[PDB]
Design a protein around this ligand. Structure first.
Ligand code: BR
Ligand code: BR
Ligand code: BR
Ligand code: BR
Ligand code: BR
Lengths: 194, 195
């Protein structure tokens, strides 16, 4: 069942590690773009103490699984086969579903309409990009006929996966910010500065 | 480009699908090997045509091995029922178990043969059955390879395919020689009924 999922006879991560430099460089540019969004999330969560704030806890744990996926597109990290990437997406979607519950509780107890709506829209983005990560995690690198050779291309699947993670990262940042704001207009979530 | 299909369900390109689109330079070397395999398989067709399969489990087993072996050579061309590497491996396993059963029956025929030369000839061919079954098992596990060349990661299935086919060709030749020799060693005193 491991050899069910090989591409051209090798593990998915091994294929990413052997992609031609041009593909690897296009992937690296997306990864660097991803690290900018991770920078915004690190700066936001570092404002808050994670005791009694599972939103912050879940944000950090979603971010750390996305880094495993980001590493996978470079042929590194713990995710070896497609099934591992799928399962990592699944964990992220679970954490997002838990973040969405907490966030909706905060929203319902908020009577500031514009703050309510902003929070709820960011929680839709969490759902959207958790789904997108699930979808993108099932797209394997592909084999293409080019000039009488069979060549491996994984750049498109890697970049779509990274792009979904970038967007999810941004949705988490907005959700953290908007959850704190909505709370100050009211709690299972304590917003203690660090 | 190789056909996408549902794999274990998400889209993927299976080993059989990859064989099916190998560059025609790779496919030409494989066809050459399959042609010489076909020659050996003819010789089995002629030999087992000459006999009735009732009570002759030697001949029953020989057509069983031939049919699975054709599934394997078809795989190297992107055809037949073996889709995944694990299918090629399990096909080699069932060939090996058939060969085990053929070896068993063969060795009892040999041990009841009073012509010493004919006994030894039969036993020699049975040794080839056992060696070539093991060797087909080995070759069934060889995967395609990828190599960074030309600024591309390029796929090649030539070497696993040719190795699989040469293994099946050796075993095919051993099986037909084993039938011819099982009968000869039977003449010297499993039913060898024609038609
Ligand atoms: Br390169
Ligand atoms: Br490219
Ligand atoms: Br609340
Ligand atoms: Br297929
Ligand atoms: Br054939």
């Amino acid at each position: 069942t491991e050899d069910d999922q090989l591409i051209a006879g090798q593990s998915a991560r091994a294929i990413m590690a052997q992609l031609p430099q041009e593909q690897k460089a296009k992937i690296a540019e997306q990864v660097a773009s991803f690290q900018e969004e991770k920078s915004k999330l690190d700066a936001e969560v570092s404002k808050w103490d994670d005791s009694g704030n599972d939103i912050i806890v879940l944000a950090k744990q979603m971010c750390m699984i996305m880094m495993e996926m980001t590493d996978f597109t470079r042929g590194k990290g713990p995710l070896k086969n497609t099934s591992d990437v799928i399962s990592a997406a699944k964990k992220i979607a679970e954490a997002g579903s838990r973040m969405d519950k907490l966030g909706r509780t905060i929203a319902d107890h908020c009577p500031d309409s514009a703050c309510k709506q902003d929070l709820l829209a960011y929680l839709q983005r969490i759902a959207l990009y958790c789904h997108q990560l699930n979808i993108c995690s099932k797209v394997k690198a592909e084999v293409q006929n080019l000039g009488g050779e069979l060549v491996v291309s994984g750049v498109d699947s890697a970049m779509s996966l990274i792009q979904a993670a970038k967007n999810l990262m941004n949705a988490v940042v907005q959700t953290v910010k908007a959850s704190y704001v909505a709370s100050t207009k009211y709690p299972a979530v304590s917003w203690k500065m660090k």
